[PDB]
Coordinates of C-alpha atoms and ligand atoms in Angstrom, one line a residue:
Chain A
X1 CA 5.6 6.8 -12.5
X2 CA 2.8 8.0 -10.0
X3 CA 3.0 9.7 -6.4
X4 CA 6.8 9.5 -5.9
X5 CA 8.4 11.7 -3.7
X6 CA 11.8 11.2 -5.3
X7 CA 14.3 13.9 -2.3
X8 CA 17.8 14.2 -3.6
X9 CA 20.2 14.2 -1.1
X10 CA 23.8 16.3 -1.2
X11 CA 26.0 15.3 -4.4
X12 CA 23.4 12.9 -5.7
X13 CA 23.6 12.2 -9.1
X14 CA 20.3 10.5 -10.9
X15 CA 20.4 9.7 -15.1
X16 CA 17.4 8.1 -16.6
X17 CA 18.0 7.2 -20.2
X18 CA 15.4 7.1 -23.1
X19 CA 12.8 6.0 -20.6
X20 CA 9.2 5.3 -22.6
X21 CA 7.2 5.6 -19.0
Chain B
X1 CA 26.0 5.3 -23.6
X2 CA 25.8 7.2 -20.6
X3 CA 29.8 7.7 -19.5
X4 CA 29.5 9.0 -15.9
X5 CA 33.0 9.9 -14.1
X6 CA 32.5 10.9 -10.5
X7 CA 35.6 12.2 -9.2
Chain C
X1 CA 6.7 1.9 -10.3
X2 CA 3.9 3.7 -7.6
X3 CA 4.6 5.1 -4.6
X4 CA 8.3 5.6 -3.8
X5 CA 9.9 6.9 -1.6
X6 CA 13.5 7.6 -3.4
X7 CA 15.7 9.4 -0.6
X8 CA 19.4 9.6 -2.3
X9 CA 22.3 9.4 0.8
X10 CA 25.8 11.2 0.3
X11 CA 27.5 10.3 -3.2
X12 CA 24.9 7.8 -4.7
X13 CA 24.8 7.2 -8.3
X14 CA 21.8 5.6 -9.6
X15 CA 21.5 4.9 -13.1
X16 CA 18.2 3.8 -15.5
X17 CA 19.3 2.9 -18.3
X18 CA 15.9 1.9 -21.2
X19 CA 13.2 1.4 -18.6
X20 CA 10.0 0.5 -20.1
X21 CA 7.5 1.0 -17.5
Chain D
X1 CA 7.4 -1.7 -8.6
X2 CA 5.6 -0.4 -5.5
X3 CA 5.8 0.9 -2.2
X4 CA 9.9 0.9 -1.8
X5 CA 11.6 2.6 0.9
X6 CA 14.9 3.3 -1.5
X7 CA 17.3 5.2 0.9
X8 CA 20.8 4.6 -0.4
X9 CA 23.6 5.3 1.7
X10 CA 27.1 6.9 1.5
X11 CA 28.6 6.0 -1.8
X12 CA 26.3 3.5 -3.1
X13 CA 25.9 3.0 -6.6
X14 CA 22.4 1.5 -7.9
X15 CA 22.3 0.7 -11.8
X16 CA 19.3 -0.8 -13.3
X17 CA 19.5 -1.9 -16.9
X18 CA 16.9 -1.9 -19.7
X19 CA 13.9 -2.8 -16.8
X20 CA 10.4 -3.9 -18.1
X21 CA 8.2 -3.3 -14.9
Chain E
X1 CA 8.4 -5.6 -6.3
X2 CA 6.8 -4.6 -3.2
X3 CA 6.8 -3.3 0.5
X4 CA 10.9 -3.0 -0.1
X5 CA 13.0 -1.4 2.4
X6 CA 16.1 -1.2 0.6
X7 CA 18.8 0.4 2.8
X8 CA 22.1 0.5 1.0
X9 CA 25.0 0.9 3.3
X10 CA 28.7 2.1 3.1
X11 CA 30.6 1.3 -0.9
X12 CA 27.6 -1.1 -1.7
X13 CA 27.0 -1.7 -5.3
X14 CA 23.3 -3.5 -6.2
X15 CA 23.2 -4.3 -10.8
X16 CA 19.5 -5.4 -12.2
X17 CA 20.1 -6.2 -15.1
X18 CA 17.2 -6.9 -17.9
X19 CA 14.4 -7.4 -15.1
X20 CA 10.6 -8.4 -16.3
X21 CA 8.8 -7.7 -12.7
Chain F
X1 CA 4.5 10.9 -15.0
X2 CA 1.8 12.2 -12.6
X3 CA 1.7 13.3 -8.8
X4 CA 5.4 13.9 -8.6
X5 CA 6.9 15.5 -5.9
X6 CA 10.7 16.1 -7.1
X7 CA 12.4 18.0 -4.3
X8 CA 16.0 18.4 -5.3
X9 CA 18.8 18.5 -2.7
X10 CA 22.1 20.2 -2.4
X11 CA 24.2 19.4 -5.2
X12 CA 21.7 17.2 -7.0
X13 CA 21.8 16.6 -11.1
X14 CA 19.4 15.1 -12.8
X15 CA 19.4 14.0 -16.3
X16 CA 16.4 12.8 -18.7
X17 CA 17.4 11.3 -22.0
X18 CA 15.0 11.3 -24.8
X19 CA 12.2 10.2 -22.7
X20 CA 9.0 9.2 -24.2
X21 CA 6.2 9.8 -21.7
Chain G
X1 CA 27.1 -3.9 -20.7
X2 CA 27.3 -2.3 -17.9
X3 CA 30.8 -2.0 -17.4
X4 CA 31.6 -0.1 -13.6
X5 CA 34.6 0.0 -12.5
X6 CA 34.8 1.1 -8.9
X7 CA 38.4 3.0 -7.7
Chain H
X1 CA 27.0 -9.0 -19.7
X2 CA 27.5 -7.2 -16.6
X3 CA 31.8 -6.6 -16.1
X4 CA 32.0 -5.0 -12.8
X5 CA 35.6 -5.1 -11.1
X6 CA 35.7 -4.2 -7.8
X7 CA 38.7 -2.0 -6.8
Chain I
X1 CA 26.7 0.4 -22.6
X2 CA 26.8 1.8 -19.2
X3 CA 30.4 2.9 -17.9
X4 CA 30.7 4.1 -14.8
X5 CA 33.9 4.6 -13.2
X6 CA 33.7 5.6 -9.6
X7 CA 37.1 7.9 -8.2
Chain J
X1 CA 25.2 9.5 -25.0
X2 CA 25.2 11.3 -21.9
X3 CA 29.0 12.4 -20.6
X4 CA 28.9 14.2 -17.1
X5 CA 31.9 14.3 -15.0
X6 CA 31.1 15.2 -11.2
X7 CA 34.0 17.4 -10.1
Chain K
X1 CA 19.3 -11.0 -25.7
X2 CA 22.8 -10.7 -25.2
X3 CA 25.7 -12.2 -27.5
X4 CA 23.6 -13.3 -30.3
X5 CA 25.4 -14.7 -33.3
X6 CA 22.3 -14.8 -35.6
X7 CA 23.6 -16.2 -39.2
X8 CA 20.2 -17.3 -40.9
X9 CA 21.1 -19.8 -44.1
X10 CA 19.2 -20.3 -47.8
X11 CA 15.6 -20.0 -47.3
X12 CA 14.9 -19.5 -43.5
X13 CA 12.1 -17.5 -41.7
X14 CA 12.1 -16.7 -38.0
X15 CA 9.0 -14.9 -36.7
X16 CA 9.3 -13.6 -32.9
X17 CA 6.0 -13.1 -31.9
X18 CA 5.3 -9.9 -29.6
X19 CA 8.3 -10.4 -27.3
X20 CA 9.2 -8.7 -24.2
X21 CA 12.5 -9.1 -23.5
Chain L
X1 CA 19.1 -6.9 -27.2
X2 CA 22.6 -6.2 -27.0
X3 CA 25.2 -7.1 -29.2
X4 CA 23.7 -8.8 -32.0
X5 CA 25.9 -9.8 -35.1
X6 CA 22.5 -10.3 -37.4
X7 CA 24.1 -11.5 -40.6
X8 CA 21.1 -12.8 -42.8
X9 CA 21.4 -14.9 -45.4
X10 CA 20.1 -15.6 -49.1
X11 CA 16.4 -14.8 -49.3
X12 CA 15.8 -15.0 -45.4
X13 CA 12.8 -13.3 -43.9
X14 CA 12.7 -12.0 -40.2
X15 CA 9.6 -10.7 -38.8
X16 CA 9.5 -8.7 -35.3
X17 CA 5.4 -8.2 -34.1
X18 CA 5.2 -5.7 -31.6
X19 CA 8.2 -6.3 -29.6
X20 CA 8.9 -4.6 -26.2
X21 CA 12.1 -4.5 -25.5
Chain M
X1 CA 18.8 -2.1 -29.3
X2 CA 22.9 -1.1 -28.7
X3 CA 25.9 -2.3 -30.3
X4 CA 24.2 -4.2 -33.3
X5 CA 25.9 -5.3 -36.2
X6 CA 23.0 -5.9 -38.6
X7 CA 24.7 -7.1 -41.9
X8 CA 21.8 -8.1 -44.4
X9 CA 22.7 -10.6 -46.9
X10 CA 21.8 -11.0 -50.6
X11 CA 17.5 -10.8 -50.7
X12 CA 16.9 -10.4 -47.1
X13 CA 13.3 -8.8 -45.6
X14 CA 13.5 -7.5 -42.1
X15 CA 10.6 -6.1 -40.7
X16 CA 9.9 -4.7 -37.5
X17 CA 5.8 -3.6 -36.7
X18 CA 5.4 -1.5 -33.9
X19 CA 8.2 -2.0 -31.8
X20 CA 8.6 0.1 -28.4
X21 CA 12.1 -0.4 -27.7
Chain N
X1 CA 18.8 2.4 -30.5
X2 CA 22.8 3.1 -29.8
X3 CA 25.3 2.2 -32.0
X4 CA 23.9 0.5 -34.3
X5 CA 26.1 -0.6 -37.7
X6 CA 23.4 -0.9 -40.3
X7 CA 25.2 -2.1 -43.5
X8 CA 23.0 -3.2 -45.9
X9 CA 23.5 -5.8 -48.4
X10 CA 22.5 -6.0 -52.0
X11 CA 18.5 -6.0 -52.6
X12 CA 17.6 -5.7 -48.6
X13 CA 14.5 -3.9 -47.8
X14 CA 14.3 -3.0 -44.0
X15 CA 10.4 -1.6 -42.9
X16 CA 10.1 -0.3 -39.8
X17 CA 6.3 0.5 -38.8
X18 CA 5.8 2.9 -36.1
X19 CA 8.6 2.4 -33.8
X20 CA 8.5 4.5 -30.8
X21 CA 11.9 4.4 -29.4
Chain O
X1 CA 18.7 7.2 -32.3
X2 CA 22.0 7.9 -31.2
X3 CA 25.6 6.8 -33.0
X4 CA 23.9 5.1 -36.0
X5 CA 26.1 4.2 -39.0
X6 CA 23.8 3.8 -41.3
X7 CA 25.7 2.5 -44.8
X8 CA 23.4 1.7 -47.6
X9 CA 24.7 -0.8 -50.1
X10 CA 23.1 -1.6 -53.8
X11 CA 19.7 -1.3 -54.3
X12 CA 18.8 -1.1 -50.4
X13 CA 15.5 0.6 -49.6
X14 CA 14.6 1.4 -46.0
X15 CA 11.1 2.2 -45.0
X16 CA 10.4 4.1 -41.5
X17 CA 6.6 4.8 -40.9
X18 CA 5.2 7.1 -38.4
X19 CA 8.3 6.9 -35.8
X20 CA 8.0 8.8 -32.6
X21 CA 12.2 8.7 -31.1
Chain P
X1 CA -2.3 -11.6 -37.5
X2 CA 1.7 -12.0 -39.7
X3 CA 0.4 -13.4 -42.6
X4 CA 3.2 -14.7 -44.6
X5 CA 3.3 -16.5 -47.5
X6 CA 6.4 -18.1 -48.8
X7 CA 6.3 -18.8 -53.0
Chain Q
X1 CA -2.1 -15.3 -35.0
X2 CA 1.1 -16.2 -36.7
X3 CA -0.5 -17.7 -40.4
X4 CA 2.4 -19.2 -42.0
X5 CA 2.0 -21.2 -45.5
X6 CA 5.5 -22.4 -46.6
X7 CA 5.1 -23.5 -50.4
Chain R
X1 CA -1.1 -7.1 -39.9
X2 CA 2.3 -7.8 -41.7
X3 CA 1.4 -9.5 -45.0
X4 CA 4.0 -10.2 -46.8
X5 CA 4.1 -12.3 -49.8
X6 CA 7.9 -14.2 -51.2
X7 CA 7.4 -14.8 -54.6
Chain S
X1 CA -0.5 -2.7 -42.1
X2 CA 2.8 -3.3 -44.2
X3 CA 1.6 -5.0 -47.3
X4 CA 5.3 -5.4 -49.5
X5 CA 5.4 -8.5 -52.4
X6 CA 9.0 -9.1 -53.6
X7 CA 8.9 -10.1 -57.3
Chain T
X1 CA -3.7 -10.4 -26.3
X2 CA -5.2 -11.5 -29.4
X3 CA -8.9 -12.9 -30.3
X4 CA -10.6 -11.5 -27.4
X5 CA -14.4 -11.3 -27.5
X6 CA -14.7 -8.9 -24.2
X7 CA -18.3 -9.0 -24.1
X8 CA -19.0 -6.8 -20.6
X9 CA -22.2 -7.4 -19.2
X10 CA -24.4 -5.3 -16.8
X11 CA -22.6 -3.3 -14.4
X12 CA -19.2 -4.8 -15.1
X13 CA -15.9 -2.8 -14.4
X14 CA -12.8 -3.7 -15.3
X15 CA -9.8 -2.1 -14.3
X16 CA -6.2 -2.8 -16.2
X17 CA -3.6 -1.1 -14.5
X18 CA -0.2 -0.5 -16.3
X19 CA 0.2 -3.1 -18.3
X20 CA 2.8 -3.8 -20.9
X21 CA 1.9 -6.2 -23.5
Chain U
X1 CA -4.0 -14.1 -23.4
X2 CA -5.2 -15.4 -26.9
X3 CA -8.5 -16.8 -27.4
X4 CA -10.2 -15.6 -24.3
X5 CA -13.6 -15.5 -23.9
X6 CA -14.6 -13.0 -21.3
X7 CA -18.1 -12.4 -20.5
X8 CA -18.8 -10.7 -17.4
X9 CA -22.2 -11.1 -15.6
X10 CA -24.1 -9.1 -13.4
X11 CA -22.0 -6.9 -10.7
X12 CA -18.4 -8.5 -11.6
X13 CA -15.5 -6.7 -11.1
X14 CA -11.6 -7.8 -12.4
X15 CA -8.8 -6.0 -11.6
X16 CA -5.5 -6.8 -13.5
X17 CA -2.6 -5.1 -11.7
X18 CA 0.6 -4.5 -13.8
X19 CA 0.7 -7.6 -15.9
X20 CA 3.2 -8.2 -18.1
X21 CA 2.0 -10.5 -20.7
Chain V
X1 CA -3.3 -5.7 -28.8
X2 CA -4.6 -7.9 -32.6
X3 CA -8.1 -8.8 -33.4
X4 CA -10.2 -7.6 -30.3
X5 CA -13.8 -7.4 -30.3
X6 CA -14.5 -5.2 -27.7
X7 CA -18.3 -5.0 -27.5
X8 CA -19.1 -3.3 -23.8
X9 CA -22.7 -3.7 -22.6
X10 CA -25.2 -1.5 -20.6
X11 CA -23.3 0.4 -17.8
X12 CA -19.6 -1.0 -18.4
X13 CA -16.5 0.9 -17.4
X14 CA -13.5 -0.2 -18.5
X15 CA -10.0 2.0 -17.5
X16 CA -6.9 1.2 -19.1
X17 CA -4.1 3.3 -17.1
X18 CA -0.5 3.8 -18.9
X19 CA 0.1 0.4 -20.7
X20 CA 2.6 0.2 -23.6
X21 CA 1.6 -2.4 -26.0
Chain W
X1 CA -3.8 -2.1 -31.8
X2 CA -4.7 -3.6 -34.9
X3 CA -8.1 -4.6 -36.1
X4 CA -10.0 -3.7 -33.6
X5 CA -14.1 -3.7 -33.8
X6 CA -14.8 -1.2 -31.1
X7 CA -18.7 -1.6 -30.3
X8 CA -19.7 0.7 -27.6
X9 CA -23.1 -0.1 -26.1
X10 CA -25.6 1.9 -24.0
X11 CA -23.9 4.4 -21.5
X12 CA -20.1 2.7 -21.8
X13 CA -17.1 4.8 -20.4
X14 CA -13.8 3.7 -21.9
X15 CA -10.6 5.8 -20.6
X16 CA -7.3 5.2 -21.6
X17 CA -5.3 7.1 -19.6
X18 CA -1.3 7.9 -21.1
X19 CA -1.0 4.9 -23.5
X20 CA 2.6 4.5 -25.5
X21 CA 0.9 2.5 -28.0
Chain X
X1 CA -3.8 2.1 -34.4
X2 CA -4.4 0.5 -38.1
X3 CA -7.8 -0.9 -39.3
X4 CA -9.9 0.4 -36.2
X5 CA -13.5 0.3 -36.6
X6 CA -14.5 2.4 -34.0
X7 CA -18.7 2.7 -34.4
X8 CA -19.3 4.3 -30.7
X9 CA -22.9 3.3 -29.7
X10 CA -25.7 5.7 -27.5
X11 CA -24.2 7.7 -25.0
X12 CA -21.1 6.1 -25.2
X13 CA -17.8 8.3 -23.8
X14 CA -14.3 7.8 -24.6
X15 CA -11.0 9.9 -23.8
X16 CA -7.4 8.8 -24.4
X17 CA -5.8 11.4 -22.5
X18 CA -1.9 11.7 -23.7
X19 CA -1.4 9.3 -26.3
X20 CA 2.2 8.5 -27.8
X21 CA 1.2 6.5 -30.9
Chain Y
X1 CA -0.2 1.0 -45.2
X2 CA 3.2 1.0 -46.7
X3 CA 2.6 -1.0 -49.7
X4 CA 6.2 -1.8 -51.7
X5 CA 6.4 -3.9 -54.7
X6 CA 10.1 -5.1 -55.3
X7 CA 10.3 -5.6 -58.9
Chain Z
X1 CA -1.4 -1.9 -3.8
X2 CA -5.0 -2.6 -5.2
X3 CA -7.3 -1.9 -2.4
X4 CA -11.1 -2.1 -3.1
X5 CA -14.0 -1.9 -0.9
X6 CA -17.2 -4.4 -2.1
X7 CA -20.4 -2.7 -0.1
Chain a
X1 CA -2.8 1.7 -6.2
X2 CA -6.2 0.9 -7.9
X3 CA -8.8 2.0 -5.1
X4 CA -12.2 1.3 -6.6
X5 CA -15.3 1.2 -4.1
X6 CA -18.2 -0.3 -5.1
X7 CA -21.5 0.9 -3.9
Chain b
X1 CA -4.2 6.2 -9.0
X2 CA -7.3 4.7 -10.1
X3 CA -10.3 6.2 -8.2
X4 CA -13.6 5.1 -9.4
X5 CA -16.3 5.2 -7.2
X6 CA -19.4 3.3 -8.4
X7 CA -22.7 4.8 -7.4
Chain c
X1 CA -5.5 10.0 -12.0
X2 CA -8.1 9.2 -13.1
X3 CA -11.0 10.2 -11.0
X4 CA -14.3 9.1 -12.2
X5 CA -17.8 9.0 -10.7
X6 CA -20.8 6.7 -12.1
X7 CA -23.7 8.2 -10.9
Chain d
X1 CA -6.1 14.1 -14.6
X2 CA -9.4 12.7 -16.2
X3 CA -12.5 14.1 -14.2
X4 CA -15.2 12.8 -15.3
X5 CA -19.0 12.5 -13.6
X6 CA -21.7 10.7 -15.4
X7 CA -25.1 12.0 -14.4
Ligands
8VH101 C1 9.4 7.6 -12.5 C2 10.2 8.2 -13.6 C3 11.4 8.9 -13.4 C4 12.0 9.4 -14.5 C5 11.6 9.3 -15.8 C6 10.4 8.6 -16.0 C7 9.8 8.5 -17.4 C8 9.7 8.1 -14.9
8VH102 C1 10.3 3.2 -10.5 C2 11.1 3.8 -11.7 C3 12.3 4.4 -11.5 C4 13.0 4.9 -12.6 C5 12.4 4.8 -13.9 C6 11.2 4.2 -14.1 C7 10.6 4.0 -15.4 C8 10.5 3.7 -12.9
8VH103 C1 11.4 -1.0 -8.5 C2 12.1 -0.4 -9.7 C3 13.4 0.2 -9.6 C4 14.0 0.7 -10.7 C5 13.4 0.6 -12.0 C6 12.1 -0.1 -12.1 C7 11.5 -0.2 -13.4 C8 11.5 -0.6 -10.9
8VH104 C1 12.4 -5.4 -6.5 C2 13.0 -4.9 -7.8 C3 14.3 -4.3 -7.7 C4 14.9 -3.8 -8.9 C5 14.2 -3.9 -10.1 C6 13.0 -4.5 -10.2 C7 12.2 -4.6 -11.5 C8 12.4 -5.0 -9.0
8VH105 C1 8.3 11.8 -14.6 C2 9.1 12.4 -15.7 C3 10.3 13.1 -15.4 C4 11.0 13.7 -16.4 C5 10.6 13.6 -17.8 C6 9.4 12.9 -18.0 C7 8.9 12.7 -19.5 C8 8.7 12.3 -17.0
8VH106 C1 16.9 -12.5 -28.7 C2 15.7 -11.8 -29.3 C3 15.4 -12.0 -30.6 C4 14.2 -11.4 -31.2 C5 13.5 -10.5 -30.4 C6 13.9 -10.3 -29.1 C7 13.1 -9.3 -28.2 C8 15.0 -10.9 -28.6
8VH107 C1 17.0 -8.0 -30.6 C2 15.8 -7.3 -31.2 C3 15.5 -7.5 -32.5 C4 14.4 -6.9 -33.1 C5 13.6 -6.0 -32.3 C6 13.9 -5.8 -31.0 C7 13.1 -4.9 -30.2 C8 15.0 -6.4 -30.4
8VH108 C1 17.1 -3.5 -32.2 C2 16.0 -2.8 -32.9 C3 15.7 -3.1 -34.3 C4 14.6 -2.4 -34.9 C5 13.8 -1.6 -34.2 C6 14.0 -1.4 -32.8 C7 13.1 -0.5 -32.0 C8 15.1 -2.0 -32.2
8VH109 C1 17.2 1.1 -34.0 C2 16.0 1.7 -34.7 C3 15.8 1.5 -36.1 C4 14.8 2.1 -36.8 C5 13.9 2.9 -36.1 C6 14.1 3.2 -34.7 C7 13.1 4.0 -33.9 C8 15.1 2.6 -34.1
8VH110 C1 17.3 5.6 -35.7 C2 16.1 6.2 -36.4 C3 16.0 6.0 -37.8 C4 15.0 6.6 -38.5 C5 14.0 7.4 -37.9 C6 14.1 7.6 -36.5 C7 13.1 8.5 -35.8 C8 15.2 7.0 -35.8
8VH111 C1 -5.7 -8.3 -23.5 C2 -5.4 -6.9 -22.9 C3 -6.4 -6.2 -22.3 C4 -6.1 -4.9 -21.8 C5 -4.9 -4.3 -21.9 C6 -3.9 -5.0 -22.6 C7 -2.5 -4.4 -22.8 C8 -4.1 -6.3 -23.1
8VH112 C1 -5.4 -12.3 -20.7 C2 -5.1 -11.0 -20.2 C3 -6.0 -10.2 -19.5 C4 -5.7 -8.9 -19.0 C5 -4.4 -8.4 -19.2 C6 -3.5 -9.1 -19.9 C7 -2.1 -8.5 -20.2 C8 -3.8 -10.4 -20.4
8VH113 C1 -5.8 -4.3 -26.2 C2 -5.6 -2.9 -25.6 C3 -6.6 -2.2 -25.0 C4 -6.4 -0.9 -24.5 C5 -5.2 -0.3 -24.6 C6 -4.1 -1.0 -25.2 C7 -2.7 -0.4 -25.3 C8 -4.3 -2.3 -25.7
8VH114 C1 -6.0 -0.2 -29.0 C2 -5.8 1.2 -28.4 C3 -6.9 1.9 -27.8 C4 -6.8 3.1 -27.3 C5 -5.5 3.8 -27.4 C6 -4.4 3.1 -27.9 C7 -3.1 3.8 -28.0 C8 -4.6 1.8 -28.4
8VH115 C1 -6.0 3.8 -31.7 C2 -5.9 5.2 -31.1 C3 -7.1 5.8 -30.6 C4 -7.0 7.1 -30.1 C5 -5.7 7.8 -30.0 C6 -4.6 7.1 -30.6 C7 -3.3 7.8 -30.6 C8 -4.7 5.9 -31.1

């Protein structure tokens, strides 16, 4: 993953699970 | 296993 | 996965579940 | 994946399973 | 993927499952 | 994972799983 | 599986 | 297999 | 598996 | 497995 | 590969070749 | 792969080369 | 690989080279 | 790998060669 | 690896070279 | 290169 | 380059 | 290379 | 690379 | 890829940009 | 890509952009 | 990547960026 | 990568930049 | 990597920067 | 090289 | 998005 | 994004 | 990103 | 990124 | 990131 302009907002829930990348 | 409750 | 622009709203889930990439 | 605009709104829920990309 | 302008709205639900891309 | 630009919100969780990198 | 269940 | 019931 | 129950 | 319960 | 009721019998190879899946 | 009953048999061989998944 | 039920038989050889899963 | 049943049988030999996971 | 039940039964020998997990 | 030779 | 000799 | 020889 | 000979 | 005689020349670039193989 | 004979001449460029393969 | 004969000439430049394999 | 006959020439740049391998 | 013959010629320059393996 | 000879 | 510039 | 410029 | 520039 | 300059 | 000048 390269140039990423990852903004949460409010009650913002992200799970990333046994990525290799 | 992701096991996600929201509310 | 380049350039992105992720903005989350109010209550979003997102879920990745064994991404290669 | 590249240049996308992800802006989710109120109480979406985005699941992406075992991606290759 | 690209030049996606994904704009979830209200209590929408989007499942990729096992994409190549 | 290069040239990120994580700015967490209000609220915000984030969870990494065994990631590989 | 996924396996969402929404309300 | 994707089980998704909505509501 | 993902399970995701939503409220 | 990842188990998070949001509120 | 989903649901994959694999019963190999007397005397049977399979070879899968760099998949992606 | 998901859900795989893999029951080999007598004398049966499987070979996975680099897979992806 | 989730949920698998891998049951080797009587003189069975699995082998898995370099796998990323 | 999640949930994985690995029962094996009489005289199996399983080789797994640099996985990364 | 996560939840693995790993039973051995007679005379089962299980190689795992160089992982990474 | 899966070189196998069977008996 | 799968090489298989069977018998 | 997987060389594997069956009897 | 896995060399194994059974019997 | 397998069996490739890459045999640059003069002055040749080549550029492979996350690939997955 | 198996078998592939690449020779590049004089001043070529070849860009391959997230391939899958 | 099996059996590659990767013989780069005079002034050759060849970038491989994140691939799995 | 397996069996691989790397044969740099005169004034070759190989970079390989985050590989999972 | 297995069996690599690496033989790097004159003024040759190579950098894996963050390997997995 | 993980070389195994089964009887 | 490959973008390159030839002279 | 590849962004190569040649000369 | 990729940014080779070539002479 | 990978930022390289030939000559 | 990989910086690298030649000559
Ligand atoms: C882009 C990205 C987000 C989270 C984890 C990884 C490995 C990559
Ligand atoms: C674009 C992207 C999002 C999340 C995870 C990955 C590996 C990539
Ligand atoms: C565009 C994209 C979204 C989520 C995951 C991937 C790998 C790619
Ligand atoms: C366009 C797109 C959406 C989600 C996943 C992928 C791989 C691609
Ligand atoms: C981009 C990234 C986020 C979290 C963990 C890793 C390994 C990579
Ligand atoms: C269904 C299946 C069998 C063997 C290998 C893969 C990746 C998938
Ligand atoms: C279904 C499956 C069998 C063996 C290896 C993989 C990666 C997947
Ligand atoms: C399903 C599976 C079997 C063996 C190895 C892996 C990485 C996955
Ligand atoms: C499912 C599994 C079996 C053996 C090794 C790994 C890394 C994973
Ligand atoms: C699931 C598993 C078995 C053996 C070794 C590892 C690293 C993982
Ligand atoms: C054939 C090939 C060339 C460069 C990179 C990969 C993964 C494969
Ligand atoms: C034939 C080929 C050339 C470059 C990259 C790939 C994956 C394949
Ligand atoms: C064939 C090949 C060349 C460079 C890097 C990889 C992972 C594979
Ligand atoms: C074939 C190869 C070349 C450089 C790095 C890796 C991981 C593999
Ligand atoms: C084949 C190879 C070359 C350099 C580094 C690694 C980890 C592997």
């Amino acid at each position: 993953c390269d140039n990423i302009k990852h903004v949460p907002g409010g009650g913002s829930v992200q799970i990333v699970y046994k990525p290799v990348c | 296993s992701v096991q996600i409750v929201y509310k």
